[PDB]
Structure formats: C-alpha cells, structure tokens
Design a protein around this ligand. Structure first.
Ligand SMILES: CC(=O)N[C@@H]1[C@@H](O)[C@H](O)[C@@H](CO)O[C@H]1O
Ligand SMILES: CC(=O)N[C@@H]1[C@@H](O)[C@H](O)[C@@H](CO)O[C@H]1O
Ligand SMILES: CC(=O)N[C@@H]1[C@@H](O)[C@H](O)[C@@H](CO)O[C@H]1O
Ligand SMILES: CC(=O)N[C@@H]1[C@@H](O)[C@H](O)[C@@H](CO)O[C@H]1O
Ligand SMILES: CC(=O)N[C@@H]1[C@@H](O)[C@H](O)[C@@H](CO)O[C@H]1O
Ligand SMILES: CC(=O)N[C@@H]1[C@@H](O)[C@H](O)[C@@H](CO)O[C@H]1O
Ligand SMILES: *C1O[C@H](CO)[C@@H](O)[C@H](O)[C@H]1NC(C)=O
Ligand SMILES: *C1O[C@H](CO)[C@@H](O)[C@H](O)[C@H]1NC(C)=O
Ligand SMILES: *[C@@H]1O[C@H](CO)[C@@H](O)[C@H](O)[C@H]1NC(C)=O
Ligand SMILES: *[C@@H]1O[C@H](CO)[C@@H](O)[C@H](O)[C@H]1NC(C)=O
Ligand SMILES: *[C@@H]1O[C@H](CO)[C@@H](O)[C@H](O)[C@H]1NC(C)=O
Ligand SMILES: *[C@@H]1O[C@H](CO)[C@@H](O)[C@H](O)[C@H]1NC(C)=O
Ligand SMILES: OC[C@H]1N/C(=N\O)[C@H](O)[C@@H](O)[C@@H]1O
Ligand SMILES: OC[C@H]1N/C(=N\O)[C@H](O)[C@@H](O)[C@@H]1O
Ligand SMILES: O=C1O[C@H]([C@@H](O)CO)C(O)=C1O
Ligand SMILES: O=C1O[C@H]([C@@H](O)CO)C(O)=C1O
Ligand SMILES: [Zn+2]
Lengths: 499, 499
C-alpha cells in the first residue's frame, strides 16, 4: 500500500523511499522545453510570440523579457543534451519552431534547410545518448506571416498550412522521432490568446483590454479552439495514413487541472466543479473521444459554439494514439454569473464558475505554487493528489487512454540569487510529491501512464513572466548562458532516476 | 566670393563667418531621423528590420544591437520636439513606420488607429512649434508579412500594397504634412538588401554569403530597383491626382555621392568614374527624368535589366516635385572587371569600377569619416566639395530640380565615454564644411536647394552598426534614454540657425 503526502513537510525526496524502480521498468523519465522559450531568434523567422512580446512588452513579463536570446539553445543544444545525459534521462520533450523550418509559414514558399539541420543534429544527439524524443509540432510560436495573412488559428486556412508543416516534420524527422505532440495545451491559446489577451496573439474584446488590436473574447476562443481541433485531427490523420511505416505515435497535449468544490456540501459549488471539468477538459476531450462538444457547452454557448460536420466529427473522434497531459495544479470551484450580454463577456465566463485556491472554510489547498507580489490573494497553491485525481478521471471518463505526463514543475523567483536559486528544495518537494501520487494512481487505478517529463530542463523565458521566475532543474546565468548547472532538484532527479 | 575649406583644420564653426543668414530667408534648417532607428517595437507590428536583425544578429551590428527599444521615441516623441524647439529648427524629417499604422501590411486587413494617433500627435506638436515636417513613407521597414507573402519589393504585388499604404498616409496626415518622401535612398535596398545582404531582407547569391536564406545578387537588385521605381511613381501619381487639394509636394530620396577618377590622367579611370555616375545616380535618375535607364546600364546589364512599358515609362518620368538628396561622401573610381558568369557576381560589379578614398598618388580625399577597426584600409574619408559637385551635377544633368538635402552627418565611436561623446568637434567640422559648400553652390551655380536636414536629431540604432557608433546632434544615454542632450554640435547648430 502506497501512502503519499499532501502537505508540507514532504519526505519523498529520499530516494530510498521513492525512485524510478518504484515504477515499471519501461517507464520514461525526463524533462521538457519549448522552442520559443529556449532557442533564440537567430536562424529563424519571426513568430507571434516575437510579435506579441515586442508590440506589448509589458505583457511579455514584468521585466519586458522575451525569447530573443534566452538560453541560446540554438548555439548550446549540445549542453542541453549534456544535462539529459547527466540525468540519465530516457526522454526529452522539445518543440520544433515552425518559423525555424518554414520561416514564410506556408511550405510552398520554401523551407530553411539550415533549420532542418539544427533539429536533425539535436535528434541525432539525443538518440546517441539513449534519450527518446517527444516532439511538439506547435508550442504556440506561429509564424507571424500567418497571423497577419489570416489571423492564424482564427481562420480555417490554418488547417492546411499546419498540415503541410507537420508533413514536412514527419518526412524529415519521423524516421527517428516516434512520439509526436500536435498542439501544446489546447485550452491555452483560445482563452489566453483570444480571450484575456494575456498570450499571443493578444486579441480580445475592446473593454476586456483596450490594448488588444482586435478581437472578441466571447466568440473567438470557440472559433480558435474549433480550428485547433480540426488542424490537430487533420495532422493525426496525415500521420496515421501516410507515416504508419515510421512506427510512431501522435497525440495532442492537454493542460489538465483537477477541480474540487469550494464548498463540498453546497450543490451549487458541486455543480460548478462538474461544469469546470466539462468546460476545461471536456471542451477538447469530448471532441477527441466522441466527435462532439459536451452537452453543457452546447447548451450554454449556443450559437457561439461551432458545429462539426459529420466528416469533421469522424476526423476528430479518436484522433490520438496517446495523450500528453500537462499537470500543475488544482482549483476550487464556486458558482459565478455568466453575463453573455456584457461587452466584457469572455468565453471563460461560460463555465459559470469562479476559481480559487482557498475553500469556503478557509483551507488553502496545498503548498505555495506561485507567489503574486502585486496581489497576494492571487497566489497559486498546488495539490499533489490532483495528479492522481486527473489520471483516474482520464482513465474512467475518457476510455483508458495511453498517457505521458508531458509537463509538471514549479517556479522559484528570479529575485533569488544564484545560491538560493540552486538550493531549490521547494522544487524537489513539488516534483517528488507529484511523482509519489503518480506511482500510486498507476498502481491503484491501473492508469496507462508510461512516462513523465518535468518542466523544465533549464531556466528559460517563461511565457508572461520574462526571466522573473525560474523553472529549470538546471540553472542558467543570464549574464552568460552557456552553462546549465544541475540545481539541487536536478541532482535529486538524477538520484531518483538512477538510485 | 565664397571660399570654403576642404581640409583640416576648418574654421567654419565660427557663426560670425557662416550662419543661417548666409542662406536665403526661407531656407529650411533641421535634422532627420527614421522610424526603425528611433521608435521601438512597442505598439507596432514586425518589419523586415526586426526580422533581419533577429535572424542574423551579427549583421545587425557588432554589438548585436537592434531597434527593439532604441531611444524610445514612441514614448519620448515630445523630447524630440523639444530638441527641435531648442535648435529653433524649421524642419524635421522623420519616417512613418508602415508596421505601426498597418501592422498586417495590406490596408484591407485593417489599420492601427493608435498608430495613426501617434503620428497625428507628433505632427501636431511639430507644427505648433513652427517646424515643417518632411515625412518619409518608407525608410526600409517593410512589414514582415509582405516579405514573407511575396518577398516584398522583389514582387510586383508591392506596388498596390505600397500605394494603399501611401493613400492612408495622405488621407490621415496630408492636411498637415506638405513635404513627402517616398522611398529612402533608392539605391540601398536593391544593393545592400538583395545584393550584398548587408541590409534587410538579407537576400543574395549562395556564394556571396552562405547565410542568405535565398536570392541572386546578379538579378535581384535590378528587379527590386525596378519595382521601387514603379511603386514610387504610382504613389506620386496618386498624390498628384487625388491629393492636389493638400497643396504639398512629393519626391523620392536619393543617396548621392560624388565620384572622382582614382587617376585623373588615366582614361580608364575617367571612364570608370563616369560609369559610376550612371550606375549609382543614373540608375534611378534616368528613369525619373526620362523614363529609361542609362544606356550604359542597358548595354552592360542586358537581359538582367527590366524594361518599362510605354505606360510605365510615362508614369515614372517626371514623378517628383522635388528631390530629397542625402549626401555623405565621395569616392575615387578605377576600372574593375565585371565577371558576369561568376557565381559570386553581384549587380554592383556591373559598373566596372572599384571605389576607394585614396587616389593613385596616395592622396586621401579628405578628413576621416568612419574608422573601420577590423580593416583600416577600409576606413571612409569625406570630401566637403562633393556636396557642391553633386548639387551642380543635379542641376545640369537632371533638369534643374528643386532639392532638399534630406541627410548629411557623421558618426563618432560608441566606445567614447559621455564627455568625449558630447565634445563632438569632429561633427561641427563635418557639418559646417558641407554647409559652407552648399551655400557656395547655391550662390555660384544657382542650384535650387531650399533646405538642409542634418543626420541625426539624436543618437539612435544605426543600420548595420547597432549602438557602436553615434550620429546624433543630441546625446542619448543607453542606460536611460529619456533625455536628448545637445552635444557641442547641437549647440553650434543652434547658434548657426539663430546667430
Ligand atoms: C536503490 C534504492 O534505493 N532503491 C529503492 C528500493 O530499495 C525501494 O524498495 C523502492 C521503493 O519503491 O524505492 C527504491
Ligand atoms: C493526409 C493524407 O491522407 N494524405 C496524402 C495524400 O493526399 C497525398 O496524395 C499523398 C502524396 O502526397 O500523401 C498522402
Ligand atoms: C551513470 C548511470 O547512472 N547509469 C545508469 C545505469 O547504471 C542503469 O543501468 C540505467 C538503467 O537503469 O540507467 C543509467
Ligand atoms: C549675427 C551674425 O553673426 N551674423 C553673421 C553676419 O554678420 C555675416 O556677415 C554672415 C556672413 O555670411 O554670417 C552671419
Ligand atoms: C491613384 C489614383 O489615381 N486614383 C484613385 C482612383 O482610382 C479612385 O477611384 C479614387 C477614389 O477612391 O481615388 C483616386
Ligand atoms: C530663441 C531664438 O533663437 N529664436 C529665434 C528668433 O529670434 C528668430 O526671429 C527666428 C527666425 O530667424 O528664429 C528663432
Ligand atoms: C501597458 O501597455 C499597454 C500598451 O500596450 C497600455 O495600454 C497599458 O496601460 C500598460 N499597462 C500598465 C499597467 O501600465
Ligand atoms: C555570423 O552569422 C552567420 C549566421 O547568420 C554565420 O554564417 C557567420 O559565420 C557568422 N559570422 C562570423 C564572422 O562569425
Ligand atoms: C466587467 O468585468 C470586470 C471583470 O470581468 C468586472 O469587475 C466589472 O464589474 C464588469 N463590468 C460590467 C459592466 O459588468
Ligand atoms: C561564460 O561561461 C562559460 C562556461 O562556464 C565560460 O567557459 C566562459 O569563459 C564564460 N565567459 C565569460 C566572458 O565569462
Ligand atoms: C569571388 O569574389 C570575391 C570578392 O568578390 C573574390 O575575392 C574572389 O576572387 C571571387 N572568386 C572567383 C572564383 O572569382
Ligand atoms: C533617467 O533620466 C530621466 C531624465 O534625466 C530622469 O528624470 C530619471 O530619474 C532617470 N531615471 C533613473 C532611474 O535614473
Ligand atoms: O508555466 C510553466 C510552463 N507551463 C506550460 N503550461 O502549463 C507551458 O506549456 C510551458 O510553456 C510553461 O513554461
Ligand atoms: O549612416 C547614417 C545614416 N545614413 C542614411 N543613409 O546614408 C540612412 O538613410 C540613415 O538611415 C543612416 O542612419
Ligand atoms: O494549470 C495550468 O498550469 C499552467 C501554468 O500556469 C503553470 O505555471 C497553465 O499554462 C495552466 O493553464
Ligand atoms: O554614401 C553613402 O552614405 C551612406 C552612409 O554610409 C553614411 O554613413 C549610405 O547609406 C551610402 O550609400
Ligand atoms: Zn527583439
């Protein structure tokens, strides 16, 4: 019987009690990254994260930081491999920058052979060290040309451009890459990119944020989410019909959260919590497992929710060989009004729920996850059991999928000095407490989880935060980015992997 | 009788001997800038200078500097006006960033009202202080979307997109702006952007520079130059047919140089010098004054030189109300081979001339203009009499045009400290020696020159050099860009203007 801790102090950092041998022998352990966050702009075209961070610098991060140079994994990809080799990692999730291999967006405009070579060298180097690549085709960095031609995922033209891009990736890299991710966190671009305008491309309704150049927060998230599902599904169909000889697997990435009732004896809070599961997870998982959106969304969103035709429904339904599940935290849900006629209405209000980290009796859900110095009532707290709850739910609700945990991690403040930054015991606690629950859910519920990739390999540009927070298991000095030095968490993870 | 100095030491910095009263009472005196170089990316879309500087950072400058924030004239435009007011300037040349008012390039995709407002406020503020705006529509900063859709000026699609952009500028600003410049230095983008790939967009033949993403240095400069002429001429026709009620004037900007024979008793050097005038100036001035390219270019460039149809020739011929002439230096010309079959052939080799600052007997043409620390034999030297020679030539060869000197200036090293940077006596010498010759050519040759705008108002991002050189008449601290402090040159210029 496995017992896991939910509250500080944790004792799971002792590799005598928890290590890779606790899991099945074939289980993959590694770390993850994304291209905008680590490579730099050298050698690639411009994308909407370059566009957004430069047009709206105060949205890039409080320091106005961006991915222009970051940790320069364009130059130092070998040092990334060296971190993985030091960890004895068996997996690495990275993304391909569309703007690095097709700077002009549309494949018929030509490819960047040097860009293709960069990824071939990385892939070859990973395989040479026994590391399995998990490659994300689209980690938000859409070529700026496509956003300016037709507003990117707002238009159905994205489907064929994304298909042609994916086809190029499969053709060039699929002989070596056997695990592909289509779109990173389906929920995020629709809501943050087109709803609140916190993320690229930065569209929203005028009274949501007057700085947005255009948009409609009430309708655009649904349009974009729909086109993401279609684009994803066209790419999965392309992979499974034309690249079956490669013997690999493909799936989407979902951001997962668990939801608990703000008041667990209040039927209204309990209803809000179940609506949250459907609006947060079901928005994408309904289409992926059934070809339709959840009924509550159909009912609530009405004419703002697009329909799939019978052909589209069939393309989207079952369009995965596995799911990449990212997991960071859990929220309490309580009812909230949905003012659909308000000029500041957003798609996120359609769930009719307000989310918190504190419940009605004053209980904070778990340890600190992210401090918000401008408003401390907006601090985020984590909940190790949430990874158990999420995995169990996916198995039971979503037809026992094959799952890889494609992100899990925690930040530490960028104001800490190097010594403090390297002594990242809060990161060991977060990682180990989640891995304990992940082992427990695999053993108790028989969820088909086959690997775990911690966010992040190294410190990088964090979307929305610049360099003001650090997520790496390895430290990077921003005054001299060459080295990636294992922190206490990286050192712990090395011992966990090879106890 | 006016006597001007050609060699150090100069004595024209004494405003008792040379001042604005030396010139006609209506003569305009001011300074110039360009949008990429001063504004920052905040509030605009991305252009090919953003693209180029980020994709090829070592081409942006030795410091890898770019126009991301620069002197932040987006925020501090009022401080620019304050410099002009301090100078008692009567003119200011600035450019409109196409990506600030039409971020998506094509006008039918929408306009950025906030971008339009930025220029309305600047214009209003200039007029309120009695400063005449001279506005450049295109100072190289093409929206990146247009370069990625169709390779910008390489394709005839640029003509209508540039026309629609210009139309928007005339509509929004032409009630207040009465002097418009179309394209900055016609010669530069074809040769540096598409020939040597020193400038955006960075196209060239593979063996000219293997880093270029695509191109052909032998043919593309001619295609781009041709489309620049057509785009320019369509915009001038639009202005003169649809905006005549505004009572303003429009013209192109030429980069001018004078050319002298490397050996003035050698017929081959003398021929090379005359070929240089035709290939450097006539490439554009032939079409602008006659609707045809110079015969020597027709003969040499052959099938690589595009033809104008009768309609195009008529559109281009006479497509100016005045010429904006930029002038910085003069070169000696000697013969050089033109290896048209070489894979590294460039359009610049077609003139059959090698250019130097030292003649055959060892004479350097004038004082130091730009030191090149990597190769000192590549140092640039200036020649004050060249502005007299250029103006005289334009009058005599090119039908006595109305001219405004739209740039003239010199850099000082970015390695100097603030005190050294502020004591910019080399800049007073350069400016005054050129103004002496400009007064002399107006008086002796009756050239119709009506204003002079010194490069630059303040320190800025210099194309190709980052922040490693300074050109301002006012100093900017890169650790805190708010202030623009008049240097000794700015202080001198103030006394020259109001003696
Ligand atoms: C080398 C090492 O310490 N391995 C330990 C093993 O002894 C322990 O039984 C297991 C519990 O899951 O965790 C692991
Ligand atoms: C997505 C998809 O099913 N299939 C394509 C098919 O249309 C194409 O003709 C063939 C050769 O290009 O590659 C395959
Ligand atoms: C240096 C190091 O730790 N190497 C270990 C190796 O001993 C072990 O057999 C393998 C699989 O568990 O993981 C790796
Ligand atoms: C106020 C002042 O110094 N004005 C001088 C004027 O005396 C002089 O005759 C002229 C020569 O061009 O330059 C100016
Ligand atoms: C460049 C040009 O001559 N003329 C245009 C004409 O085509 C257009 O119909 C009119 C109204 O839009 O504005 C003018
Ligand atoms: C403060 C200052 O210098 N103001 C002068 C003003 O006296 C002069 O009348 C005008 C035209 O020359 O130029 C300005
Ligand atoms: C930040 O930038 C936007 C312009 O992009 C501006 O509208 C907003 O007021 C600024 N935010 C703050 C908090 O100052
Ligand atoms: C600079 O960058 C380019 C890649 O953009 C590279 O090909 C070239 O070698 C580098 N130049 C020098 C002098 O190192
Ligand atoms: C607009 O929404 C904000 C936050 O969503 C809220 O504080 C405000 O009350 C809303 N205004 C109206 C008119 O509903
Ligand atoms: C920066 O980091 C690398 C690796 O530690 C080191 O070898 C190099 O000397 C350092 N550069 C400077 C300028 O300190
Ligand atoms: C290529 O041109 C470079 C400079 O233009 C020159 O040094 C070299 O000799 C040329 N090579 C050939 C094969 O002509
Ligand atoms: C920077 O420059 C402006 C103008 O001189 C000054 O008012 C401001 O205090 C300075 N900011 C800092 C942080 O030094
Ligand atoms: O915030 C941590 C990490 N989280 C992720 N999603 O939750 C993103 O996919 C990744 O790009 C981001 O850096
Ligand atoms: O090099 C000085 C100056 N020279 C100019 N041309 O010669 C450019 O138009 C301007 O953008 C550049 O900064
Ligand atoms: O729950 C979530 O986690 C992440 C991130 O906030 C972790 O820092 C994200 O992108 C969500 O939507
Ligand atoms: O003669 C010329 O002068 C400028 C510049 O080099 C001055 O620094 C330029 O763009 C030319 O072609
Ligand atoms: Zn940048």
């Amino acid at each position: 019987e496995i017992t896991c801790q939910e509250n500080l102090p944790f004792t799971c950092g002792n590799t005598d009690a928890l290590n890779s041998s606790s899991f099945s022998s074939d289980f993959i352990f590694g770390v993850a990254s994304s291209a905008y966050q680590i490579e730099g702009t050298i050698g690639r075209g411009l994308n909407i994260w370059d566009g957004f961070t430069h047009r709206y610098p105060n949205k890039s991060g409080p320091d106005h930081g961006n991915g222009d140079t970051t940790c320069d994994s364009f130059s130092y990809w070998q040092k990334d491999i060296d971190v993985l080799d030091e960890l004895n990692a068996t997996g690495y999730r990275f993304s391909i920058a569309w703007s690095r291999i097709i700077p002009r967006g549309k494949r018929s405009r030509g490819v960047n052979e040097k860009g293709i070579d960069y990824y071939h060298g990385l892939i070859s180097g990973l395989i040479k060290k026994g590391i399995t690549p998990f490659v994300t085709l689209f980690h938000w960095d859409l070529p700026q040309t496509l956003q300016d031609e037709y507003e990117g995922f707002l238009d159905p033209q994205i489907i064929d451009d994304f298909k042609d891009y994916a086809d190029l990736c499969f053709e060039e890299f699929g002989d070596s890459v056997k695990y592909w991710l289509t779109i990173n966190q389906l929920y995020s671009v629709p809501t943050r990119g087109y709803g609140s305008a916190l993320d690229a491309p930065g569209r929203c309704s005028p009274t949501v944020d007057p700085s947005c150049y255009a948009g409609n927060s009430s309708t655009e998230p649904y349009i974009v989410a729909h086109h993401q599902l279609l684009a994803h599904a066209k790419v999965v169909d392309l992979y499974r019909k034309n690249y079956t000889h490669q013997g690999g697997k493909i799936g989407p990435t979902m951001i997962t959260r668990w939801f608990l009732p703000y008041n667990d004896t209040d039927r209204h809070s309990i209803a809000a919590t179940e609506r949250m599961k459907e609006f947060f997870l079901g928005w994408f998982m309904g289409p992926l497992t059934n070809g339709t959106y959840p009924q509550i969304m159909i009912d609530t969103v009405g004419e703002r929710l697009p329909s799939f035709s019978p052909e589209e429904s069939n393309l989207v339904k079952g369009s995965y060989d596995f799911l990449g599940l990212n997991y960071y935290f859990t929220q309490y849900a309580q009812p909230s009004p949905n003012p659909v006629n308000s000029t500041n209405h957003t798609a996120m209000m359609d769930a009719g729920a307000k989310l918190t980290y504190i419940n009605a009796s004053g209980h904070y859900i778990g340890p600190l996850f992210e401090k918000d110095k401008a408003d401390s009532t907006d601090n985020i707290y984590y909940y190790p059991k949430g990874i158990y709850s999420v995995m169990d739910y996916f198995k039971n609700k979503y037809y026992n999928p094959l799952i890889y945990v494609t992100e899990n991690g925690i930040s530490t403040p960028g104001d800490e000095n190097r010594n403090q930054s390297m002594l990242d015991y809060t990161r060991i606690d977060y990682l180990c407490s989640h891995l304990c629950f992940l082992n427990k859910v695999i053993k108790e519920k028989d969820v088909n989880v086959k690997g775990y990739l911690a966010w992040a390999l190294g410190d990088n540009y964090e979307f929305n935060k610049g360099f003001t927070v650090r997520f790496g298991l390895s430290y990077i000095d921003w005054n001299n980015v060459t080295d990636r030095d294992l922190k206490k968490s990286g050192q712990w993870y090395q011992s966990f992997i090879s106890p």
